[PDB]
Every structure is written in C-alpha cells, then in structure tokens.
Design a protein around this ligand. Sequence first.
Ligand SMILES: C[C@@H]1CC(=O)N(C2CCCC2)N=C1c1ccc(NC(=O)N2Cc3ccncc3C2)cc1
Ligand SMILES: C[C@@H]1CC(=O)N(C2CCCC2)N=C1c1ccc(NC(=O)N2Cc3ccncc3C2)cc1
Lengths: 466, 467
Amino acid sequence: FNILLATDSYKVTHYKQYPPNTSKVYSYFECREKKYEETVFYGLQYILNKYLKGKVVTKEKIQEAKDVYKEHFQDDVFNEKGWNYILEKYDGHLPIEIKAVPEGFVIPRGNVLFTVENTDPECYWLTNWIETILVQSWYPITVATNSREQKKILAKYLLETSGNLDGLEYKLHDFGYRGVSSQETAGIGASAHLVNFKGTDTVAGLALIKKYYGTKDPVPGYSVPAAEHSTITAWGKDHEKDAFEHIVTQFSSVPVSVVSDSYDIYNACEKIWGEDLRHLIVSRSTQAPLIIRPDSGNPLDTVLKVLEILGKKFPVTENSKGYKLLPPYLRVIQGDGVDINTLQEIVEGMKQKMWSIENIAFGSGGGLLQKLTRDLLNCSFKCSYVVTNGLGINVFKDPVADPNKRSKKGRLSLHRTPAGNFVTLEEGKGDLEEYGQDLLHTVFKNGKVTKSYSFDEIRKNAQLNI
Amino acid sequence: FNILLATDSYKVTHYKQYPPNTSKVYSYFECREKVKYEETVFYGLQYILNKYLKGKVVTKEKIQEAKDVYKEHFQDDVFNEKGWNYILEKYDGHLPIEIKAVPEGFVIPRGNVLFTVENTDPECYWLTNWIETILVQSWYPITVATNSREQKKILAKYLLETSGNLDGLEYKLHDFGYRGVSSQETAGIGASAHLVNFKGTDTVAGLALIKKYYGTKDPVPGYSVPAAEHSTITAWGKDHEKDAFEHIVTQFSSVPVSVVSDSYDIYNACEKIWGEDLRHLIVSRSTQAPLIIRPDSGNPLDTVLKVLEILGKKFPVTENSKGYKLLPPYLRVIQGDGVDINTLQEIVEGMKQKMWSIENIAFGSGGGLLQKLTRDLLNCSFKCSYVVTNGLGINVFKDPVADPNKRSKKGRLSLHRTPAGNFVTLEEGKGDLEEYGQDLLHTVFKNGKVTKSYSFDEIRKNAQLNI
Ligand SMILES: C[C@@H]1CC(=O)N(C2CCCC2)N=C1c1ccc(NC(=O)N2Cc3ccncc3C2)cc1
Ligand SMILES: C[C@@H]1CC(=O)N(C2CCCC2)N=C1c1ccc(NC(=O)N2Cc3ccncc3C2)cc1
C-alpha cells in the first residue's frame, strides 16, 4: 500500500490551487442532515492503524508515485518536494492531528464527527490529500447505523409479542460475505454489523475486530451448522428427505439451519419435517432446535404460510402476551430478500397474525452489507477553516440550488446541550466555554494513534435505550 | 490472508452434509435470467485466482489458526482439520481444483455458464463449494464492467446522433468513486472494471491492480487532468471566487482544467465570472487545454441545460453538420453529481431535445459507478449442477415452487456459439455430442496454477461495442 497513490487523482494537483501563504487547512466530517436521525460512529480506528499511522512515506513510495502520475497526467504535477519534506523532517510520519467522537457513539445527523488539520505549515496540502481514505469511514458508519435501525425494529416487535428482549442480539444474522464488493469490505462490513449483533457467517469480520479493536471474549461473533442448496440437492431430487435426516442426525446436539425450498418449501414443512421426519424433530433439545430456512417467494407470504403449516403439525403454545409460539425445538429463519423495509413488513405481518417474533430470525446479505451508499447518510468531508498570511478565515460552500449541501463555518467542537443532547459549535465559539468541554478527542497526531476503543466499549456506546 | 477463514461459516460444516461416497462436486456461475441488462462483461476472475487461490494457500499454521477460531465461533469442533491436512501433505497446500471460464472481456447474454469449478481429487469433494464465497465476489467487477459498458452504449448512441462520430467516447464517463466505495480493495477492483470500457479515472487504486494482475502495452490504463474541489475554491474566501478561478486556470494554462463552479452560485459563476470577468483567459485557451466547467448541485438535467444556455449566450456557439449547437473547443462541461445510468440517459436525451451536441458534455460518476450496485442486479449466482456418488454421475439442481427464476441448470455444462452467432449453454453433458463448435470455457486454474491469462489490452478488445 502507498498512501501517495491512495487519493483522488485531482488532489495530486491541489497544492498549486490553495491561496499562496496558506499555513493551515482544517476540515471536518459529518453525516449531513436533510428516517436515519442518528448515526453510529464506527470504523475510523481501523483506517488510522491500517493506513495512516507510522512511517507511511519512503524514497521508493515517492518515486513510484512520481512515475505513475507523470504517465497518468501526461505531465509532472506531482508534489515531490512536499512529500520529500515529510520523509526528511518526520521520518515519513504524517504531520496531521485528527479529533473524533468516541467509536460506538450515537450522534444525531448534522454534527461534527471528526476534524483533520496539518500540524506543520508546509503540509497545508496534506489535510485534504487524506479526504478520500478517511471518507471511506462512510461504509462502517452506514452498516453500523442500518444494522442498529433493524435492531430497534426487532426490539419493538419482540418486546410487544414476548414481553422481553431474550435472543435480540441473534435476531439478524450476516449472510453478506459473497454479496459484498471485496474481501476487505467483507471484514469492515461484518465488523460494523457485530457492533449491534453477535450472529455472523462473514468470518472476515472476526480477525479485523481482534487485530484493530479487541474483545474480552475469544470471538465477537458466532454461528451454527447450516445446509445450502448444494448439500440438499446433491442427494438427488427424489431424496430430499434423506438429505434432511442425514443433516439433522449429524448435528443432533447443536442448532442446525436447513434450507427447505429446494423443490417445494410447503411440502417440505408439512410432509417431510411435519410427518416423515417429525420424530427426529420433537426429540431435539431446546439448546439444539431445527431452524427451517425458506429462501424464495414473497418473504412475508412465505413466512406466514410456513408458520401456519408448522403450527398445525407441531404443538403450538400461547405465550403470556397472547402470541403463538412453536415448541422450543423448532424455529424459522427468513434469509432471502431481507432488508430494513422487508424486515419491518415481516414482523408487522407476523404480529397481525398473532405469531411471536420469538419464532423467527433473519439472515441478510446484500441488504445488510452491500445495498448502501455514501448518499444514504450524506457522509461528507469539507474544509471549514484556513490560515493565509497568518490570519484565520471561516470557509464554507453554500450552493444556491441545494441548501442541504451548505457546509459548516470555521473551527468546530461537539458539546452537550443543557437538555443532554448534542450541538456542533461553529466559528471557534467552543472557546467561549458556554457549553463546557469539546466531546471530540485527539485520536491521531504526528503519525501516532493517541486514543483507542475496544470493541466492548464500542458495543456499550451503541446499545439501544429500551 | 487465510483461505480457511475466507468462506461463509456454514460451509465449514458442509463436508458432513453431502451424500456419503461423493467423489465429485461440480458447480457453475451464471448471471441468471429474469430496465433489462441483457448481456454481461465477464471480468475479474483472474484477479481472484492470482491474489487468493494460486500456489501454497494451506500451511500448518493456517490450519491451527482456523481450528482455534472455529472452536470458539461454533462453540463446537466441526472444522475439517483432516481434509485440509490432506491438501497440505498431498499437494503442498495447492488446491486440487479445476476452473474453466469464458475469456475475460467476453460479452455473454444472461442465463449462460461463465465459469465452472470442480475438485480434481475425490477426497476434496467438499472444496468446490468452500470457494463459492470468494469466487462469487466476481459479481462486483462483472456488474461494474457491465453497467459501465451499458452507459458507454447510451453515450455512443447520443454522440453518434448529435455529432456524426464517436470521437472522445472513451473519455465521456470519468470515475469519481474512490471516496464513495466500501474499501481500498473495492476501489482498485471497481476502478479496473470501469477502465475495461473507458480511459478516464480519478480512482488511482485501479492502475496498480491492472499493472500487477492484467498488464497493458501503454504505461498506464487510465488518465486524468488537474481539477479543483470546493476546498481549493472556498479557501480563498467567499468574496474571492474570481481570484480562485483566475489563479487555477493560470496555473494549468496548457492542460485541460476542470473547475467546480457551484460553491456559491453556479449560474452567477458561468454568466458573470467565466462569461464576463475571466472571459479573456478562457477564449485564449488551446483546443488541447479547454476550461471544463463543473456544476455539482441541483437537478442534474435542469442544471446542465441552464449552464449550457448561459454559456451559449456568453461564448460563440457553432451549429455542427447534424444541426446541434457546439460550444467553442476551449470550453466544455462535466456533470459529476448525481450521475448514474438512469440520470445519464435523462441528461443526454434532455440535451438532444434542446439541440445541444453530446460533444459539449462529459460525466463524472462516483457512487453510481462503483457502489450503487448489488449481486441481485444481474442475479450473479453459483450452484452445484453435477455430483458423482458411488461412482455414478447425477444431474442436480434447485427448482423452488414459488420462484421459477431461481431454477438452476442440470449436469455438466459447456458454452457454444449458435449457427446464428449467439451463445448457448448445453446441459446434462450434451456438449460431449459435438453438435456445436468447441466449448468456449477454457481451463484458467488447475491444481494451484493459473493456466491461462489475458492482458488488459485483450479484455478491452473483447469488451468493445459492435459498431
Ligand atoms: C438465528 C439462529 C438463532 C440463534 O440464536 N443463533 C445463535 C446461536 C449462537 C450462534 C448464533 N443462530 C441462529 C442461526 C440460524 C441460521 C444460520 N445460518 C443460515 O441459515 N445460513 C448461513 C448462511 C450464510 C450465507 N448464505 C446463507 C446462509 C444460510 C445461522 C445461525
Ligand atoms: C471530461 C474531460 C474531457 C477529457 O477528455 N478528459 C480526458 C483528457 C485526457 C485525460 C482525461 N478529461 C476530462 C475530465 C474532466 C474533469 C476531471 N476531473 C474532475 O472534474 N474531478 C475529479 C474529481 C474526482 C472526484 N470528485 C470530483 C472530481 C472533480 C477529469 C477529467
């Protein structure tokens, strides 16, 4: 990895575009306002450690970058002198200070989450060089936020239909490993989901958390044995019952998820599970349920008909809230077409038919880790303050045709209001101490990570009210 | 990187779930059939083969790491230590796998086999689908390359209609997406997939990926020009936007320069600052070094049309041989905000209706180009179609009652040219009947070696538009 090749091409040319005698560029990140009213701040620490800390400039990296940019631009615009300065003066350590809200913090939209400034007048151009790398924070922030919003919905419906939150942290399982754009994305995205839940099949998340954040527990996330279409269909069309019986017998003492829609989900539930193999299901421990997995059709319609089928073949109870409950040896996971909108629709549909959310868990792949953009929470990095000819100026954009893109002015700080909410003070007004101490902390200075959070603290910070 | 930790958790348990006496699992990848994305660019497998699958991918340390993680992950000892130890000892940690694939850059209709995966050793029947997760991430470069090519088709159509040629087509959609993707690794893969169709990128990560994994005759596969951002304009102070413009175009007087002009008022910047105050520094510029005015806010179509209307009244407009209005060659526009395949179509159609040549405009796309894409867009999917159990081959498939679109293909698969020059996938080993040409799938990976590679130059050639 070469940080001199880890920026948008045009930023290579920006050192020639700032006002002459500019000693400071000060920039901030926010999830711009215009529903996702609050964001989980998560993922910066990964970027600080993997990409920004320590000796990130070498003589070889300056030469590689010079040679690429000469061909890329068909011209010699690369700031060799500026980068050589970093190498010689700071032994290739970035003269940058980053202040950030603690990771796991749940902050309303339109608040400063981190700030970036150069610590050496010569490196005024460096603040926005690292915009591109830092702005990729959008992704863990957005996954963590969207996952937490889904947990709020599950919390509401579980509490309404059951009268408690038991199993909440296992209700949304990460299926997204194959559905993300890369290995690196898999690790970051799966880690962001595990801020809110403990169930993942995206193994890449575990090593990232252990290396960059750390947990008391040996692993931050768990799974159980489960079938896929290959392990059912390989038995032949006429032997689906043989595949089911072999799989539940192999995993007789742990929870086992069995995809049941290879040929006919409704036949599999009513005839195979419900009659042919019923004796191998009703004998299973409460600690080792069969989890039937439909994987096709209208997600709500399929879940309701699956539960109606199972309710007639298996002994259903009515819980303290008046909602129907399968026996403890039998559960359902809907793992197809699940996103925040269809999750809401399924649990509301279940509640209307008097089915407890105790009966169901969700698996989400593309919905959870991939079908997300930087536009969803308007994650944005902008310059708010420069010093030119020794005088500080408050700078901003305010496009006539889009007031939602107006950026904040001057030196920024995050404060508690008297009512215990958050406010971002602009124009250095934090210095007036009318709102107490700045809640941002120095997390990075002059190539060192100066403040860090365990995954355990991040989880605690990201908890729901209830 | 540890390939034993690079699968879906449940695949760790699948070796205990196959029919006993299964010697072979054969699986295939397709962009399943179901506006309408009828043909896909096959691109990206070679990256995955080299970075993740080739050579000694199993060590004693990787087996122990995986065993220790899975014991905690499952709270149970389901990990296939014996199967992985077998690969270490028998093949020096090289995967006993054969992958056959259509050549990269190939444009194939939906619902066709693009690659096949099978174990080459009976003991490693479980290995074929272990590597489903890693291989299925091919969806991303395939989908970026395909969506980029579909945008090139739209640009081609409107450029040809309004100008009478395709000059500059391969520079008309610029990659702005580096900050808008989920990771550094995604940035490189995505930017490389776009460069199959275009030559303009700001996503520098793509260049190194292509150089390392594909290679080009040309020193670099992609190019850029100096361009401002809001920081380099707004840093001058709100009352000095003209000073920022003049300093920037003077600094880059001899190359194309893109200048974001919407910091305060795009319409004021175009009419008063570019159009009157700084007009003398614009009309003197070379054809090789235009000013490129960049709007970055408002309704993308409405803003582009009003920007062109403003510039057409401050600058000498010609009418080309097709009857379409053309800015002077020293002045172009790039719309780099809210651009995706749908808004690109809407802008060029809107421009054509107002008699503006597509010669006047270029597009920058970030999230639209590299991030706002899913595995479900082309139904990119990996399924087992053939197993050998107790020495007899069985044609296998899924066929869910409530969704016929998820029916998978049966048996040993091959890809053929039809007599009419289209593609067909033959099922059930019917390729072995020599009734069609040769199989278009070639061995690209066998027993830990990459056996066939394509340069980026061949991939580009394969991905060309017909015309
Ligand atoms: C939700 C159910 C309840 C539960 O409390 N757990 C917890 C027990 C402790 C570990 C997680 N796990 C459960 C569970 C159910 C199904 C699965 N896996 C599953 O159905 N598949 C994994 C996967 C990955 C990628 N594509 C499809 C699938 C299907 C995993 C965990
Ligand atoms: C469209 C115009 C026409 C053209 O032929 N070229 C080619 C000249 C040969 C190299 C590329 N480039 C063009 C061009 C215009 C703007 C830029 N860059 C640009 O506006 N920005 C880079 C960037 C990156 C991320 N967010 C915003 C921007 C703004 C790059 C190239």
